[PDB]
Amino acid sequence: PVKPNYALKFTLAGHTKAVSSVKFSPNGEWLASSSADKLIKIWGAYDGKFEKTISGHKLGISDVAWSSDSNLLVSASDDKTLKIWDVSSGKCLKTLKGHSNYVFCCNFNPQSNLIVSGSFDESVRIWDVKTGKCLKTLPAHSDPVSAVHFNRDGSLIVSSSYDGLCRIWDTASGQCLKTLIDDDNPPVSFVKFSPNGKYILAATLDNTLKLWDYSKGKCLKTYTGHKNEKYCIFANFSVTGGKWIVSGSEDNLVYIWNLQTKEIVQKLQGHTDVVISTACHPTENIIASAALENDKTIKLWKSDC
Ligand SMILES: c1ccc(-c2cn3c(n2)CCC3)cc1
Numbered sequence: 001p002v003k004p005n006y007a008l009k010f011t012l013a014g015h016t017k018a019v020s021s022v023k024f025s026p027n028g029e030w031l032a033s034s035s036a037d038k039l040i041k042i043w044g045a046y047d048g049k050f051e052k053t054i055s056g057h058k059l060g061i062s063d064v065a066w067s068s069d070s071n072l073l074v075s076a077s078d079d080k081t082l083k084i085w086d087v088s089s090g091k092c093l094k095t096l097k098g099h100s101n102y103v104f105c106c107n108f109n110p111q112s113n114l115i116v117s118g119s120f121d122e123s124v125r126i127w128d129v130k131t132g133k134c135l136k137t138l139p140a141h142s143d144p145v146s147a148v149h150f151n152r153d154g155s156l157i158v159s160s161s162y163d164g165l166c167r168i169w170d171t172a173s174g175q176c177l178k179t180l181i182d183d184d185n186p187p188v189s190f191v192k193f194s195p196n197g198k199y200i201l202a203a204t205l206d207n208t209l210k211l212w213d214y215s216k217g218k219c220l221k222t223y224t225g226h227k228n229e230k231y232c233i234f235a236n237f238s239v240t241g242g243k244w245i246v247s248g249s250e251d252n253l254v255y256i257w258n259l260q261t262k263e264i265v266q267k268l269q270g271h272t273d274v275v276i277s278t279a280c281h282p283t284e285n286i287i288a289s290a291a292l293e294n295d296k297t298i299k300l301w302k303s304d305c
């Protein structure tokens with residue numbers, strides 16, 4: 001319909017510091033969370049029930065991502081490394097070493113033989129999952145990298161940075177295929193492809209989300225009304241029910257927008273600190289949200305449409 005009706009079903013407590021990142025497993029069974037407390041935690045996606053803790057990093061974790069078969073995780077940490085984890089055993093399979101500063105963002109490609117990472121050292125790196133060795137280092141940006149993401153077939157990587165740029169990279173060659181600039185260049189705090197791979201969603205620290213057609217290099221939609229001036233907040237395409245845009249906010253709310261009309265259709269209340277991360281369940285109308293230091297909780301919300 002024209003409004004979803006997301007309601008709080010579960011609150012997940014257990015991280016002892018700010019939560020940084022939540023992600024649903026591709027098979028829809030699990031939620032993974034990462035924290036400034038150096039831990040990864042696994043939860044049931046439908047019941048919110050705590051499953052296990054995965055540890056190893058020497059400093060806080062900024063991001064976590066699932067392999068396509070839901071069996072592996074990769075995490076990105078202030079200790080300048082990434083780790084690949086076997087979720088079932090908790091074993092750390094590889095430690096990816098190479099970045100010279102905080103690793104801030106990470107993702108598998110759809111085939112999940114590659115990982116891409118972004119760092120405070122202003123580079124983007126492409127790693128081989130099986131050997132744990134860095135395949136490419138891209139001179140991507142002139143300020144920290146805030147997000148990295150593979151498109152639907154893994155041929156392209158999008159990156160964003162505080163330098164105000166979104167860039168598109170050819171995975172196989174490492175060549176910069178495109179630089180997106182608008183009328184102005186505020187810091188870009190987040191970026192990711194649309195599910196079909198034709199568009200790019202980009203967040204800027206001027207309280208604004210933009211939908212880009214990247215092939216034509218034009219900005220199509222603009223989403224506002226939330227607060228985002230300081231933090232790198234995840235955003236999502238909601239595609240299981242109504243077609244929405246979902247994002248956290250520095251006023252402690254989860255914002256949901258009609259993707260077409262750009263109107264705010266729902267604002268979720270409940271967190272007590274900045275909502276830094278949101279995720280959308282692959283098959284059900286479920287949203288996971290997570291908050292910073294004064295809150296430390298993850299919330300699971302359910303809608304009928
Ligand atoms: C604290 C911790 C993590 C974060 C964060 C991590 N990533 C993003 N934001 C966007 C992409 C990855 C922001 C603040």
Ligand code: NA
Nearest residue numbers: 189203232233
């Ligand atoms: Na953001």
